[PDB]
Write a protein that binds this ligand. Sequence first.
Ligand SMILES: Nc1ncnc2c1ncn2[C@@H]1O[C@H](COP(=O)(O)OP(=O)(O)O)[C@@H](O)[C@H]1O
Ligand SMILES: [Mg+2]
Length: 369
Amino acid sequence: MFENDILVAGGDPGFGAIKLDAGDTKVLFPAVICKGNERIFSALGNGNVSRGTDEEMQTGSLDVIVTNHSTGVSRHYFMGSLAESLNPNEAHYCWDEDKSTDEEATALLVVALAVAQKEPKANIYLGTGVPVKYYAALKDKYEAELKGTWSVAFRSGPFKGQTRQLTIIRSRVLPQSYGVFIKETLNEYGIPISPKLFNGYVVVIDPGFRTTDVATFYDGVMLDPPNSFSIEKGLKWAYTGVAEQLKEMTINHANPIETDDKELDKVFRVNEGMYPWNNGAINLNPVMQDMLGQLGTDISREVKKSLKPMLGKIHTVLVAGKVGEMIFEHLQFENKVLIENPQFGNATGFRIMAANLVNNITKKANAAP
Ligand SMILES: Nc1ncnc2c1ncn2[C@@H]1O[C@H](COP(=O)(O)OP(=O)(O)O)[C@@H](O)[C@H]1O
Ligand SMILES: [Mg+2]
């Protein structure tokens, strides 16, 4: 790695989960935020058991004050998986692409970088990616916003105390699916590794949480918007279906289940589709894989609507994101690859791009900074 521990790090392909690649270490948690309170009653030992294997795997157990050090203002958050399990009435996914407003939407990534950073203060060069259709109209705003000094104070577990500071030197922003293509085509040190991916046509898919995003790479180049686009049918649309089916499985009761997506996401993350109830369990997995039969069909049709003129030419369809593991058997393409370590595909490519933009000839000193 580099001769100074400034983070070269790539991350926030986040609407379902912030995820972040910093080389030998990685951060991952669901993108749930709450403007948390003192935890005063619920701090009791009554269920306060830790199950983690590292400080890294203390991820998502996050209880913080975040400070915009560049402006001297501060806010208190429960962040990630903890917030599913403190304020389930008021904790929510942050849900807009724009981060010019919404310091909340930046705070998730600020916390993730502070978890990644091993030592109390350092500088960072950042890679990240907005969803594909926005890259024509949004990247410059992130390249202004997502910069300068931040700090995080922590109260839970191995993180506790330790009021870390970090400074983003500068950020490189890319269209979200491109990170997958990058991590598949390039070595750690930016050398290309298989011309089989460069020549002819490749299609690359993040079947993501808020959105499913698709880009066509021809001869090594991402093609322009009518060939590389974005689709509102992300996993959250399937949970909106599962919620109506769970409601119609409990409308027969005197007061029906009325879950927002967050509880279904919890139920698939934590305990494999068994929604908790009297007599122990309601099992959603039949309903869920009935929905992902729909969503995988629809991602295939929403693709073919814009790509069918090209369809015969395609070497392969790359699939990424957590939902890649959930949908991949159902997508209607003859040559099709689920990329290695599916979760991080966008983030890893953003790190590899950040390494390019933190050479001395791109942005570093000749000295250690
Ligand atoms: N730590 C985790 N444990 C289990 N499932 C996870 C975890 N992190 C993310 N997922 C789940 O994967 C889905 C999000 O997929 P993701 O690739 O992160 O979508 P996106 O890139 O578009 O934001 C959600 O259901 C989310 O809860
Ligand atoms: Mg995604």
